[PDB]
Amino acid sequence: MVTFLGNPVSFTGKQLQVGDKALDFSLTTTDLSKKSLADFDGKKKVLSVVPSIDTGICSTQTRRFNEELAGLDNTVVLTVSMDLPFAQKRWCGAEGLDNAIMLSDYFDHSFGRDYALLINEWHLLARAVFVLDTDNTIRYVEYVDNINSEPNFEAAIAAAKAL
Amino acid sequence: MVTFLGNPVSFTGKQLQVGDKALDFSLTTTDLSKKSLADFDGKKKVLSVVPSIDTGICSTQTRRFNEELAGLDNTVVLTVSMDLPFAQKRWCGAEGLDNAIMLSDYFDHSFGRDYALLINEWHLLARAVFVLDTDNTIRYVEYVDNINSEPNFEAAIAAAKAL
């Protein structure tokens, strides 16, 4: 169903949907320290997942989301990819977004496995966007079918704004 | 006694020693395909393992061996890291080393755990240098005690040329 590099890819287990509660995680940040869902309590989150910020669509997604939602109070933008912390760090620097919150799942692939976003054929994270409320309940989700294409920014942001 | 980021680190299993046969592997190259020992059959190989090319020392190391051991007939310098293929490819273009052979272990972490180079605390690859025989026998190997320091280029380079 979902496609990557002109070919259908698969996953394992079920993916969270609107209404479900966002699964906790332990990801390595850009300064090598770990982060979990708790570190973001009391905030609404826009969970953005990309194959690798070292590629065009994934870089634009991350850049654009951080910018277009920067003016949103009580809301934080989490980017999760398989890039090493060092790759995400280089990115921030090049883009002038040193404060952007970048999370890597390289250590375990646990985030990808728990969320069923780990592509079985490539072990990279499939493109997706979540908008969680304060209770970490998913109020919006988008699993881009054609991973090699941009996500729906409008819907995502409009959803994040209404919340 | 190996350290990383100033603190001591350990591994699981036993690391290979000179005289031992290099274990096989299936790593992803920069074009996203997979390579194994079989793909460099009948050639001398300089296995340089690094924590991440998006870091100072690692960059220098990958650049040095490639330039120095360049031209060496029937000899290939295989770079292995946890860096995503995209990171390795990007680095190659920025450094002007487009023909350089980069292999990623992001998928399985199989190389790291098989060679016992997968740092238990970080799940990154410790800095090491191998010089394999045409029969894939380890004729020389160095495990940098201080992963955050450069290896013995002279010693490694001399072995390859002497092989």
UniProtKB/Swiss-Prot annotation, chains A, B:
Catalysed conversion reaction: a hydroperoxide + [thioredoxin]-dithiol = an alcohol + [thioredoxin]-disulfide + H2O
Entry GO MF terms: thioredoxin peroxidase activity
Pfam families: Redoxin
Ranges of residues in domain Thioredoxin: 16-162
Database matches in Gene3D superfamilies: Glutaredoxin (3.40.30.10)
Disulfide bridge positions per record: 58-92
Active-site feature positions: 58 (cysteine sulfenic acid (-soh) intermediate)
InterPro entries, alphabetized: Redoxin, Thioredoxin-like_sf, Thioredoxin_domain, TPX, Tpx_CS, Tpx_Peroxidase_subfamily
Record keywords: Antioxidant, Disulfide bond, Oxidoreductase, Peroxidase, Redox-active center
E.C. code: 1.11.1.24
Family listed: Belongs to the peroxiredoxin family. Tpx subfamily.
Record note on quaternary structure: Homodimer.
PANTHER family, A to Z: THIOL PEROXIDASE (PTHR43110:SF1)
More details: The active site is a conserved redox-active cysteine residue, the peroxidatic cysteine (C(P)), which makes the nucleophilic attack on the peroxide substrate. The peroxide oxidizes the C(P)-SH to cysteine sulfenic acid (C(P)-SOH), which then reacts with another cysteine residue, the resolving cysteine (C(R)), to form a disulfide bridge. The disulfide is subsequently reduced by an appropriate electron donor to complete the catalytic cycle. In this atypical 2-Cys peroxiredoxin, C(R) is present in the same subunit to form an intramolecular disulfide.
Purpose of the protein: Thiol-specific peroxidase that catalyzes the reduction of hydrogen peroxide and organic hydroperoxides to water and alcohols, respectively. Plays a role in cell protection against oxidative stress by detoxifying peroxides.
NCBIfam families reported for this sequence: PRK00522.1
Entry protein name: Thiol peroxidase
Source organism per UniProt: Streptococcus pneumoniae serotype 2 (strain D39 / NCTC 7466)
